[PDB]
Scaffold this active site. Sequence first.
Site, mmCIF file in Angstrom:
data_model
loop_
_atom_site.group_PDB
_atom_site.id
_atom_site.type_symbol
_atom_site.label_atom_id
_atom_site.label_comp_id
_atom_site.label_asym_id
_atom_site.label_seq_id
_atom_site.Cartn_x
_atom_site.Cartn_y
_atom_site.Cartn_z
ATOM 1 C CG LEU A 22 -23.665 78.365 103.763
ATOM 2 C CD1 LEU A 22 -24.805 79.330 104.023
ATOM 3 C CD2 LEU A 22 -22.341 79.050 103.994
ATOM 4 N N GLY A 23 -24.010 74.095 105.307
ATOM 5 C CA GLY A 23 -24.117 72.963 106.169
ATOM 6 C C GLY A 23 -25.099 71.937 105.704
ATOM 7 N N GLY A 25 -27.520 68.399 107.127
ATOM 8 C CA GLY A 25 -28.098 67.652 108.228
ATOM 9 C C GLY A 25 -28.994 66.578 107.653
ATOM 10 C CB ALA A 26 -31.162 63.978 109.089
ATOM 11 N N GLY A 28 -31.846 68.312 105.552
ATOM 12 C CA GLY A 28 -31.544 68.807 104.218
ATOM 13 C C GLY A 28 -30.234 69.564 104.297
ATOM 14 C CE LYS A 29 -26.909 69.506 100.006
ATOM 15 N NZ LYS A 29 -25.833 69.383 98.965
ATOM 16 C CB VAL A 30 -27.962 75.805 105.053
ATOM 17 C CG1 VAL A 30 -28.044 77.314 104.924
ATOM 18 C CG2 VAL A 30 -28.989 75.310 106.046
ATOM 19 C CE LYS A 46 -34.140 75.609 107.813
ATOM 20 N NZ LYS A 46 -33.823 75.704 109.268
ATOM 21 C CG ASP A 143 -31.959 71.177 117.793
ATOM 22 O OD1 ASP A 143 -31.382 70.272 118.419
ATOM 23 O OD2 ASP A 143 -31.716 71.415 116.587
#
Length: 338
Positions: A22-23, A25-26, A28-30, A46, A143
Amino acid sequence: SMHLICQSGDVLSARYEIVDTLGEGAFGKVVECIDHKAGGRHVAVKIVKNVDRYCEAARSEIQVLEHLNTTDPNSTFRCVQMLEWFEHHGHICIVFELLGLSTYDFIKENGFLPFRLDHIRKMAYQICKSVNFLHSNKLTHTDLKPENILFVQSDYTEAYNPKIKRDERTLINPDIKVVDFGSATYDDEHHSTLVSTRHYRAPEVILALGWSQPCDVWSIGCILIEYYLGFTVFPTHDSKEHLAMMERILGPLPKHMIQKTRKRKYFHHDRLDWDEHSSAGRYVSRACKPLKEFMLSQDVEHERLFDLIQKMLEYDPAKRITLREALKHPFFDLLKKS
Ligand SMILES: Nc1ncc2cc3cnccc3c(N)c2n1
């Protein structure tokens, strides 16, 4: 090492089958998963990188969501529901209700075009209500950005809108939730000196003057202008350029904030040390404009939106509108009986 355990078909905790990403980032991921112990329900998991920085953030998020999901089990205030957490091959995984695209992906996949004003209105109200609920619980999110606002469902209808000469995606339902509480901070907690993703960072943060709830309000202001424009308002990585961008759009920073900053680098004698006739300078002059010049219409509803944004983008955090006041703003009147 994370790629070893996040692929399609993998099963986590003898329960969740990975469908797709799904996405990333730094952090980790989802991934989207099928929950085989809950009848096939799809959920979002996540998976956090096995790194202290991000690990502590995840433990922190778990604390914060246990608080919020308890206070608000029906999610009246639109924070994402955490269903469970667990360890998988040394990685913290947190399970969430599955939502739609982020407001960022939607804009991206729609060719970086703005949302319609009536959707912005509903979305803006929900964002403000949600974060205001955080602020009621002595929390700052820190954020907020369009990646962390998600449509509840991103189903869309299509029509050939010849104002652009191109097939068009239109949201059926513009309801959103807020996600990502791993930077969220209680009033009493230690406040780290650098918070927020660069483009949504408030001036009190950039100048390291201290921060709290008001910095979220600045972030929401930025989010709203991006929804209206369909692109990022402060597309820069450099802090000084960012401040120059603010001046071109919002005018000079308050004298009293400049005098107080620990970041002497950025200034000379009460003004930003910024050469307008430089390469970067000339780009800022021609791209960036006074706020109100971004308006696409003199129609009162547009004016109303821009008045709200202007007040969210008040430099001085002590003067910046609060979300409590923001929810009473005339922009939102169209959403109420009368
Ligand atoms: N589609 C979807 N559904 C739920 C999510 C929860 C999340 C919770 N925290 C961060 C990111 C998250 C996501 N990207 C999510 N995406």
